[PDB]
Amino acid sequence: ACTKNAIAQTGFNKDKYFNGDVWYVTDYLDLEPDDVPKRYCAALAAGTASGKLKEALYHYDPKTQDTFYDVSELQVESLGKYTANFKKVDKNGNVKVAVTAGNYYTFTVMYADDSSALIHTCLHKGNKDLGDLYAVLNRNKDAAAGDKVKSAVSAATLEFSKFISTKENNCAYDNDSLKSLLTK
Ligand code: HEM
Numbered sequence: 001a002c003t004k005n006a007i008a009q010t011g012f013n014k015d016k017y018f019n020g021d022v023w024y025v026t027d028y029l030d031l032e033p034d035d036v037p038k039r040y041c042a043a044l045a046a047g048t049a050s051g052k053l054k055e056a057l058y059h060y061d062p063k064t065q066d067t068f069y070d071v072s073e074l075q076v077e078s079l080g081k082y083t084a085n086f087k088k089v090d091k092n093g094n095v096k097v098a099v100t101a102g103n104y105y106t107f108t109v110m111y112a113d114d115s116s117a118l119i120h121t122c123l124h125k126g127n128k129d130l131g132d133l134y135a136v137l138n139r140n141k142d143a144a145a146g147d148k149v150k151s152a153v154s155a156a157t158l159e160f161s162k163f164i165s166t167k168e169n170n171c172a173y174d175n176d177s178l179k180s181l182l183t184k
Contacts (some may be wrong), residue, residue: 002182003031004132006108006120014121017112020047020182022175024141027163032131038164039063041171043136045178055084056181062169068096069177070111071184072105080109091177093184099125102126111152115139136163141173 025042045056057070069091072084085104088097097103104124111118117137123130136145136153145153145160153160 001032001129002106002122002132004120004122006081006110006132007123007158008078008108009111012080012109014079016114017109017117018046018053020179021045021051021139022173022178023117023137023139024173025135025166026138026141027136027160027165028106028164029134029143029158030131031133035131036073036133037061037063038086039169040164041166041169041173043141043173043175043178044137045175047179049182054084054182055176056184057086058173058178062170062171069181071181074107077106082107089181089184091174091181093181110134110156111149113148116143116146116149118149118156134158134163136160141171142167 021044022043030036039062041060041062043058047054053074055072055074060067069089070086071089072086074082074084077083083104083106085099087095087099089095106122108120110120115138119135121133136149150160
């Protein structure tokens with residue numbers, strides 16, 4: 001179960017965040033015990049496509065090889081805070097699991113600049129939530145976390161030392177598929 005009302009960044013710049021480009025997860029923190037694997041990778045694209053606010057997600061377990069993509073339309077709750085009902089798709093946007101009530105995530109942009117971001121998500125999927133999940137993002141998949149985003153982690157009353165890095169998993173991303181999925 002999720003327990004945090006994450007606060008969106010003051011002055012959040014939606015058009016810069018949702019510019020159609022890719023964000024890589026470099027570090028993550030799940031508040032719940034062994035909610036997610038210790039070794040993981042993930043990335044997303046975020047943009048407006050034909051007037052609609054969209055995200056495309058990619059998940060890959062580097063040990064089991066489990067791979068999936070998602071597309072969602074984001075609804076606005078407030079500046080930087082969204083509710084997303086997702087559909088599981090292949091990399092080409094063909095639907096594998098349709099949108100359904102009960103399958104949604106919330107998404108809060110706590111900090112962002114042109115290169116880095118801190119987000120919170122709460123996943124709801126039928127019978128399961130995946131507890132509060134924080135993610136440090138970068139435009140460069142290999143970037144070490146800089147002072148702006150590390151300071152934002154501190155300002156959220158979190159300890160960056162507890163975040164788990166994704167960097168040592170050899171993950172490789174299809175950033176072309178992520179961008180194209182925004183339209184699907
Ligand atoms: C970057 C932000 C992230 C968002 C918005 C997000 C969102 C989601 C969504 C919507 C699903 C369900 C997809 C489907 O069934 O079609 C999912 C599943 C999952 N995510 Fe994330 N995720 C993100 C990052 C992560 C990270 C960094 C981990 C870390 C380990 C992670 C681990 C998982 C796991 C293991 C599942 C499978 C859950 C299951 O079905 O039991 N996610 N995520």
